[PDB]
Structures are given as C-alpha cells and as structure tokens.
Scaffold this active site. Structure first.
Site, PDB file in Angstrom:
ATOM      1  N   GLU A  42      -5.320   1.975  -7.163  1.00  0.00           N
ATOM      2  CA  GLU A  42      -5.289   0.857  -6.247  1.00  0.00           C
ATOM      3  C   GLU A  42      -6.346  -0.197  -6.591  1.00  0.00           C
ATOM      4  O   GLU A  42      -7.449   0.141  -7.001  1.00  0.00           O
ATOM      5  CB  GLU A  42      -5.596   1.323  -4.819  1.00  0.00           C
ATOM      6  CG  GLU A  42      -4.645   2.408  -4.245  1.00  0.00           C
ATOM      7  CD  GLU A  42      -5.081   3.834  -4.484  1.00  0.00           C
ATOM      8  OE1 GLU A  42      -5.743   4.132  -5.502  1.00  0.00           O
ATOM      9  OE2 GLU A  42      -4.727   4.686  -3.631  1.00  0.00           O
TER      10      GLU A  42
ATOM     11  N   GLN B  83      -3.195   8.558   0.691  1.00  0.00           N
ATOM     12  CA  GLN B  83      -3.921   9.349  -0.313  1.00  0.00           C
ATOM     13  C   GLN B  83      -4.434   8.433  -1.394  1.00  0.00           C
ATOM     14  O   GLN B  83      -3.858   7.404  -1.698  1.00  0.00           O
ATOM     15  CB  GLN B  83      -2.973  10.358  -0.960  1.00  0.00           C
ATOM     16  CG  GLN B  83      -2.476  11.472  -0.050  1.00  0.00           C
ATOM     17  CD  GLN B  83      -1.613  12.441  -0.818  1.00  0.00           C
ATOM     18  OE1 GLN B  83      -1.556  12.392  -2.049  1.00  0.00           O
ATOM     19  NE2 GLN B  83      -0.899  13.294  -0.103  1.00  0.00           N
TER      20      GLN B  83
ATOM     21  N   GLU C  36      -0.607   0.445  -5.401  1.00  0.00           N
ATOM     22  CA  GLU C  36      -0.518   1.397  -4.314  1.00  0.00           C
ATOM     23  C   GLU C  36       0.765   2.218  -4.428  1.00  0.00           C
ATOM     24  O   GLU C  36       1.827   1.696  -4.786  1.00  0.00           O
ATOM     25  CB  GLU C  36      -0.594   0.650  -2.965  1.00  0.00           C
ATOM     26  CG  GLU C  36      -0.601   1.526  -1.707  1.00  0.00           C
ATOM     27  CD  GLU C  36      -1.723   2.615  -1.731  1.00  0.00           C
ATOM     28  OE1 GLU C  36      -2.558   2.698  -0.870  1.00  0.00           O
ATOM     29  OE2 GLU C  36      -1.687   3.468  -2.608  1.00  0.00           O
TER      30      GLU C  36
ATOM     31  N   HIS D 142       7.093 -14.538   8.317  1.00  0.00           N
ATOM     32  CA  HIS D 142       6.917 -13.888   9.608  1.00  0.00           C
ATOM     33  C   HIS D 142       5.844 -12.810   9.541  1.00  0.00           C
ATOM     34  O   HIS D 142       5.275 -12.444  10.553  1.00  0.00           O
ATOM     35  CB  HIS D 142       8.252 -13.372  10.169  1.00  0.00           C
ATOM     36  CG  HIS D 142       8.696 -12.048   9.639  1.00  0.00           C
ATOM     37  ND1 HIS D 142       9.722 -11.914   8.718  1.00  0.00           N
ATOM     38  CD2 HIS D 142       8.287 -10.787   9.946  1.00  0.00           C
ATOM     39  CE1 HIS D 142       9.924 -10.618   8.503  1.00  0.00           C
ATOM     40  NE2 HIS D 142       9.053  -9.920   9.215  1.00  0.00           N
TER      41      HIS D 142
ATOM     42  N   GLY E 233       8.319  -2.928   8.521  1.00  0.00           N
ATOM     43  CA  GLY E 233       7.302  -2.613   7.568  1.00  0.00           C
ATOM     44  C   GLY E 233       7.725  -2.861   6.117  1.00  0.00           C
ATOM     45  O   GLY E 233       6.872  -2.860   5.232  1.00  0.00           O
TER      46      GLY E 233
ATOM     47  N   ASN F 206       0.814   5.828  -2.396  1.00  0.00           N
ATOM     48  CA  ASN F 206       0.740   6.629  -1.189  1.00  0.00           C
ATOM     49  C   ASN F 206      -0.267   5.965  -0.251  1.00  0.00           C
ATOM     50  O   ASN F 206      -1.432   5.897  -0.567  1.00  0.00           O
ATOM     51  CB  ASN F 206       0.356   8.066  -1.542  1.00  0.00           C
ATOM     52  CG  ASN F 206       0.487   8.992  -0.376  1.00  0.00           C
ATOM     53  OD1 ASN F 206       0.194   8.634   0.745  1.00  0.00           O
ATOM     54  ND2 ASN F 206       0.941  10.181  -0.639  1.00  0.00           N
TER      55      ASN F 206
END
Ligand code: NA
Length: 240
Positions: free
Chosen positions: A69, A64, A59, A45, A186, A61
């Site tokens: 990353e 920031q 990752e 979905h 989320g 934050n």
C-alpha cells in the site's frame, strides 16, 4: 460487488480505495482509478461530503497489511461543474482528485488507461467491475478486492422502460443487470474495465444502482461514460 470473485492482487493495479477519516481511523467509502501519478478519477457523488479524504493505492485487503500500500492525502478536488448532487440521473458524476504526492508505480500501482474519446461499446461487450463495495444488498464491504463480470447493456436497451427508462443518458454506460452480479454501495467511483482490441481500458466510473437493491434484474449498474469526458479530464489536469 455482489456476486463477485476475489481479484488477483495484480490484476487491477489502477484501482484505488478512497477513504475518509473516521475518529482515529480511516474508512473506505468509494473506489477510484489512478490516471496520473498524482491524479485519481472518481465519482462526484463520492466527494459531496465535507470529509478529510485519502487515497490508498496498492491496496488489496482493507483489513490486513498487504505490504504494497501507499497512502496519500487528497490535495485538491475538482468536481465536474455540471454535477448536481440531488440529480444523479442528469449525469456528470465524475471528479478528479489531485494527490498531495506522486505515487510510485509497480505491479500493484499503475495508471488506468482510458478509452479514446467518443468510444461506445457494442451491446454485451465484456467488462469487469471491481471494488470493495457491499457483497449483498444491505450487506457489508468486502475485505478483499472483488471483481464481477458485467457485460454492457447498450443505450437503446438500458433506456427502455423495463430497464432504466429516462434515467439513463448517453453519457453513461450500463453493465450487468442479471440479478446476481452487480456493483453495490462502496463500489461508486471505481472502474468498469472493458476488454477492447486485447487491452483493458476503464470505460466507466461507477455511479448508481437501483434504490430497490444492488443486484436487481433489468437494473444494470450505471457508470459515468469515461469516453464522454476525455477533454474535460485533460483540461482539468492541464490547468492544475
Ligand atoms: Na491492506
């Protein structure tokens, strides 16, 4: 994640942030689990919309520079062929994303280990959900990666009438339901990590919560059961 705590930045190195291009920036939309250096497991979905997606590994934050990353485009999306976006309760809420590049592994970036096919957790087994999802029903995304302790709720209980009834299938894992801690919008597509024989494995892909709210007593967070899809996953990776 409602009722979470901030994760240590090297606790969950298989967690990824799935983001879509939004104007001149990128917005987090879902979680995922890195399962090969060039493949991510997420919810079907999460990729229903026709957006430009990227994955961020390493990752912590969203707001920031963490110094860890790696950003990588999504090259190919393979949704489970039985997925039906207007019937999430039918299951099959799983998709694999082939990344444009292979990411580099380190203490912040590791493959998620998956359970053996067919594994079903006993009721009340210890797990953590992780993600950057909303921190309250109708709230906002977390900045820093959150974790919450959500013990499993077995099929017999989860599919009882005061829980999810017919909506939960044996191809799903339920966890939580205490009215305080939960997944939330989320967090979809991200992992449920459960400690078995001393080792965390990703037993769930976050799929849904109650339309009445995230942390609702007797509406545990519902996950696609990864152990039901091992052959599907292997077949996709071997044919792509
Ligand atoms: Na960051």
């Amino acid at each position: 994640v409602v009722g979470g705590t901030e994760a240590q930045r090297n606790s969950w190195p298989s967690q990824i942030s799935l983001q879509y291009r939004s104007g001149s920036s990128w917005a987090h939309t879902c979680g995922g689990t890195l399962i090969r250096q060039n493949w991510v497991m997420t919810a079907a979905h999460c990729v229903d919309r026709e957006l430009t997606f990227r994955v961020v590994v390493g990752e912590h934050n969203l707001n920031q520079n963490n110094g860890t990353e790696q950003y990588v485009g999504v090259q190919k999306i393979v949704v489970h062929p039985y997925w039906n976006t207007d019937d999430v309760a039918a299951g099959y809420d799983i998709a694999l994303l082939r990344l444009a590049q292979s990411v580099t592994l380190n203490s912040y970036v590791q493959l998620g280990v998956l359970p053996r096919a067919g594994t079903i957790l006993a009721n009340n087994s210890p797990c953590y959900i992780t993600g950057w999802g909303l921190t309250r029903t109708n709230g906002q995304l977390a900045q820093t990666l959150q974790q919450a302790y959500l013990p499993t709720v077995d099929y017999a209980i989860c599919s009882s009438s005061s829980y999810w009834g017919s909506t939960v299938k044996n191809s799903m894992v339920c966890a939580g339901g205490d009215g305080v801690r939960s997944g939330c919008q989320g967090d979809s597509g991200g992992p449920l990590h459960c400690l078995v024989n001393g080792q965390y494995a990703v037993h769930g892909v976050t799929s849904f919560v109650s339309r009445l709210g995230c942390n609702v007593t007797r509406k545990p967070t519902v996950f696609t059961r990864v152990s039901a899809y091992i052959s599907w996953i292997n077949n996709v990776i071997a044919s792509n």
